[PDB]
From a paper:
Residing in the ER membrane, [name] removes the inositol-linked acyl chain from nascent triacylated [name]-APs (dubbed [name]-AP3) to form the diacylated forms ([name]-AP2). In our quest to find stable proteins suitable for biochemical and structural studies, we identified [name] from [name] (cPGAP1), which shares 20.7%/29.1% sequence identity and 33.8%/45.7% similarity with the human/yeast deacylase, respectively. Due to its higher model completeness (81% of its 1183 residues), the cPGAP1S327A structure is used here for structural description. cPGAP1 contains a transmembrane domain (TMD), a lipase domain with a typical α-β-α hydrolase architecture, and a third domain with two jelly-roll subdomains that show a classic β-sandwich fold. The lipase domain of cPGAP1 exhibits a typical α/β hydrolase fold, with an eight-stranded β-sheet sandwiched by α-helices.
Among the three residues in the Ser327-His443-Asp407 triad (which we will discuss later), we initially selected the [name] mutant for two reasons. First, it exhibited only residual activity (0.4% of wildtype) in the FSEC-assay. Second, compared to the S327A mutant, the asparagine replacement of a histidine residue in [name] was expected to cause fewer perturbations to the triad geometry and thus to ligand binding due to the similar volume and solubility between these two residues. Since the yield by mixing the separately purified cPGAP1 with TGP3 was low, we co-expressed Strep-tagged TGP3 and His-tagged cPGAP1 [name] and purified the complex (dubbed cPGAPH443N) using tandem affinity chromatography and gel filtration. The gel filtration profile monitoring absorbance of general proteins (280 nm) and enzyme/ligand (585 nm for [name]-mCherry, 493 nm for [name]-anchored TGP), as well as the in-gel fluorescence, indicated co-elution of cPGAP1H443N and TGP2/3. Subsequently, we determined the cryo-EM structure of the liganded complex to a nominal resolution of 2.68-Å. However, the ligand density near the scissile bond was broken. Thus, instead of a triacylated substrate (TGP3), the results supported the fitting of the two products, namely a fatty acid (palmitic acid, PLM) and a diacylated [name]-AP (TGP2). In addition, the PLM carboxyl is distant (5.3 Å) from the inositol 2-OH, where it is attached in TGP3, suggesting the fatty acid had been hydrolyzed. Taken together, the cPGAP1H443N structure represents the product-bound state. In cPGAP1H433N, the 1-alkyl chain tightly associates with the enzyme.
Numbering used by the authors:
A (entry chain A): 138 to 873, 895 to 955, 983 to 1094, 1102 to 1150
B (entry chain B): 1 to 4
Amino acid sequence: PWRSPWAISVFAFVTSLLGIGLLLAVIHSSVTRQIDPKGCRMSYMRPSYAKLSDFDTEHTRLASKYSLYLYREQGIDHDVKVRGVPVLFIPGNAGSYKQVRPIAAEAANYFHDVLQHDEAALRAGVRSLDFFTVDFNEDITAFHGQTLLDQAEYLNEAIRYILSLYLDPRVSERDPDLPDPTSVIVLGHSMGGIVARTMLIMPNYQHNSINTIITMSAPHARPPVSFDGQIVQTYKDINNYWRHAYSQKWANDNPLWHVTLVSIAGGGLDTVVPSDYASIESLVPDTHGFTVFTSTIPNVWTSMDNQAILWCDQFRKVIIRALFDIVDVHRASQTKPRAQRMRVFKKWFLSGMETVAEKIAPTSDPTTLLIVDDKSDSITAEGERLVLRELGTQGSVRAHLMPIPPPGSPELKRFTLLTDTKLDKPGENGKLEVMFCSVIPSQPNPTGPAIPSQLDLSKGNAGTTRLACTNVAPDVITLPASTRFARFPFSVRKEAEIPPFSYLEYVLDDISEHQFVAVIEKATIPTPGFVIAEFSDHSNSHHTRHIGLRNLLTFGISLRLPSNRPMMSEVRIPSVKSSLLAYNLRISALECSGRKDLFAPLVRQYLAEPYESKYFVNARQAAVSLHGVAPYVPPPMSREPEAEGLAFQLWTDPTCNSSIQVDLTVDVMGSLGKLYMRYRTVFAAFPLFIVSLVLRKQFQVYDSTGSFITFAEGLDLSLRQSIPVMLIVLAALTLSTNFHQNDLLIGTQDPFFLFLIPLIGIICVGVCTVVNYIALSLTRLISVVISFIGFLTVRFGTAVLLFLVSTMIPYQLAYLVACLVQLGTLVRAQRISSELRSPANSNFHNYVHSIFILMLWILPINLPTLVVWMHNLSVHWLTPFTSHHNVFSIMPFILLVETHTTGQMIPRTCCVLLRHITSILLLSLALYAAVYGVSYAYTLHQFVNLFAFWLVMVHSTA
Amino acid sequence: GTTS
Ligand SMILES: *NCCOP(=O)(O)OC[C@H]1O[C@H](O[C@@H]2[C@@H](OC[C@H]3O[C@H](O[C@H]4[C@H](O)[C@@H](N)[C@@H](O[C@@H]5[C@@H](O)[C@H](O)[C@@H](O)[C@@H](O)[C@H]5OP(=O)(O)OC[C@@H](COCCCCCCCCCCCCCCCCCC)OC(=O)CCCCCCCCCCCCCCCCC)O[C@@H]4CO)[C@@H](OP(=O)(O)OCCN)[C@@H](O)[C@@H]3O)O[C@H](CO)[C@@H](O)[C@@H]2O)[C@@H](O[C@H]2O[C@H](CO)[C@@H](O)[C@H](O)[C@@H]2O)[C@@H](O)[C@@H]1O
Ligand SMILES: CC(C)CCC[C@@H](C)[C@H]1CC[C@H]2[C@@H]3CC=C4C[C@@H](O)CC[C@]4(C)[C@H]3CC[C@]12C
Ligand SMILES: CCCCCCCCCCCCCCCC(=O)O
């Protein structure tokens, strides 16, 4: 019986309805659930660009296509001359050279306002930053690999030209005793950072010409999409280059020994590049770089888009300060040595509470000699926390000396100080100064003059105890201010910004060589401000909840930290590692009894790797979403069991004497929406798994009964046996020193995430049904247009295609034209089948429609190369094409489409061997699309080309 | 500024 192409089974319609339903739920809850606060302040400037037009085709062939600019900021740069450290900004996928605007303008203003007067800073080798930016014509870099290589080659030549600029007296005004620059600092955005890494492997790279790469939201670990084979190969090249170079034991054999790479990720608000791909932990050792999120950068504390990471005001200031702390024009490479650069980057980008954080004060030179009476009024008893409700009660400079406990106790102990008042730098009279004091011997022990050491007379008694004291300002941790009028760690309005808190955290072994911690209260009149300092035991402050993921997802975890709690408490859940699961954190009300608390509770949700910390000021209700173990990225490196999973750091007022409750439960819809960044690229490949299994069932029934069933009927027959079985095979495949372990299927071998295979399968069933109905609608619509033209008329009245591809037409244009000719054949087939309604006309229509669906699901992979080619034609760039690859990638489709235009139906199918070859080919295509589809989506075109050649063979046999 |  004639079965309509539009008819669908109830079983296949319900399954497709769930697939579309689960797609909407994932998409909807990825834009509404667990969304981070937006806290970027817009930045304004006066932009200007000087085109370096002497950098032309004599220097590089690509200079007819690309351009180089020097940023000049109005009010600062009054001429196009280079007077400082050269910095190169690389824009990303379809980015603009005019995106350096914010960061280049802040660098121009900061040197004008502050540094150019700081005479010590210039004497230390600090000059202005010359920001060069490159115009790539908004190239689609993430979708074409030859574009990436061209950009890297152009930029190596551009660095040669930039460094040549500093030799010309007519263009460079610099001190005559300075060395000539031999390096450029590279700041790359998105694909821009990837080009920077590629720049170091290209043949025309000049050695030692890049030593500092800072990338903003760059996918270092993995290509964003794998539609081009050259992108995948270049990622393999650069990732292998970093891994091999840093795996060398002798630094002379390490080409990247002097290179530091810092990767900054926008976070959860970045929906263009997954922040999971920014992790360089599998590429760069901690001595040479790190991955940091903008939510952990002090005085930024916000997540950002892919675009806002450049113009955000807070982050702009932070990055310019970090860049100005590394430059050194006294060295030919215009930066400090590698270790000093790493220390500065850690200071400016990291929270300071990491394990890699370095403490300066404990072993630093003493900066102040303090005189205190022997009456021990200042010296307090051990085990008492120092609480200063107000500053300046007495009206004179005071010293509070806290004795450091002896290290005899086996338990680990920490000294923690929290204040909302800015701590004085050495040699500065402010409101408050904290310093580590060591007792000076009564006997005149031989020592230096202590000329930097200043005096502070506070005794006025015979004792006059002498103390040599080191200011702890170098090691101050800046914490967002958690007052009870604060909602976010940031403030979009600069006027409403609360001055942040100051935090000190020391292990007792670090400061055991000292005798006291001196909190010098310099205020005289009573001024607002609190200081809490105490020593705490690791047992009392740190809690670990060893609860499995199943129990955590079922019941959640609840803690009741006690009232005796130290000011700072940590709660670690080692089983919270996945980036795909989102939680909800609740902190109980601090019932401060009889008094208001000194500050509101502050929570730091953080991960050991990558450096991804999030702050919740006035914490009561926090959305806990983390960037942990992501699906397709290389596996995390070995770590201590004390740094695994998720930890919460809690600061509360300890004087309230009220216990606090911490609850953590799972957010099901937020967890569901976490899947969109991670699995959006599955849908260029994995729906071919469903289509190939449907075409397998259509050909099976045809070869056995002679009837080519509709795509919907084939889908209904496949959902009963074939598709469920092959999803079980995918699950079994997942369960069965390599950095490409997580590149196939779901990318997660973890058996917990096996439900993702049925989830993706059902969503792709729904998507295939919808695309089928779209193709049917398009066929009917074109047929209606043709019939309408016919009625308007009535009432009112070859073998050359091979030559085209070999010369100038890329096979993607030919493929699009083949798809259009196939649509025309489909329209004729449908019209004929409606006119005649023969069983032979239904077979041809169904067969042509299925082949059209197969072609249409490969078209997405080929379209990105078409736009690149059209763009290059617009710019007048011509790219030669290898005739062997173009011809062999398009002839099977050309021949199939021609055969269909002749109207010939596929011959029905030693004969059983030809019958089984079609089944085997379609099964292999389904399995290959499922397994290698995400990472090698460019090979699907070739595989489907092979299947089309097989169909042409079967057509030829009869 | 003059531009954002
Ligand atoms: N003052 C200082 C500052 O400044 P400004 O900026 O002004 O300010 C700010 C702002 O902002 C905004 O606005 C903005 C502005 O602008 C201006 C600018 O402009 C430009 O620039 C630009 C450029 O041009 C562009 N291009 C962009 O770029 C970028 C770059 O930059 C980077 O780097 C990169 O990275 C990227 O990002 C880029 O972008 P794009 O390009 O767009 O990209 C993105 C995308 C891409 O891709 C797409 C596509 C892909 C794929 C596709 C392909 C293929 C496939 C398919 C095919 C087809 C098929 C069919 C057939 C077959 C059938 C079937 C079978 O990407 C994305 O999106 C990603 C994703 C995608 C999608 C996905 C899909 C998938 C699906 C699936 C799903 C499923 C799921 C599953 C699950 C489950 C599992 C289980 O951007 C930039 C910007 O910046 C320039 O200018 P010039 O030069 O002039 O240029 C011109 C031209 N246009 C510069 O200069 C400037 O600046 O404004 C405008 C207006 O006017 C606008 O538009 C913009 O936007 C606003 O605001 C905002 O902001 C921010 C954002 O932005 C935030 O934050 C805030 O809040 C707001 O909202 C305003 O207002 C402001 O003012
Ligand atoms: C994945 C799910 C949501 C499918 C959504 C696609 C839409 C366009 C589909 C779903 C069911 C379809 C209908 C099912 C069957 C018929 C009978 C046929 O004689 C005419 C078309 C008609 C009336 C279809 C029109 C298009 C339709 C409404
Ligand atoms: C058929 C399409 C579905 C599968 C592909 C999913 C597309 C995801 C988009 C990722 C590419 C984003 C382009 C910018 C990349 C960058 O700036 O680095």
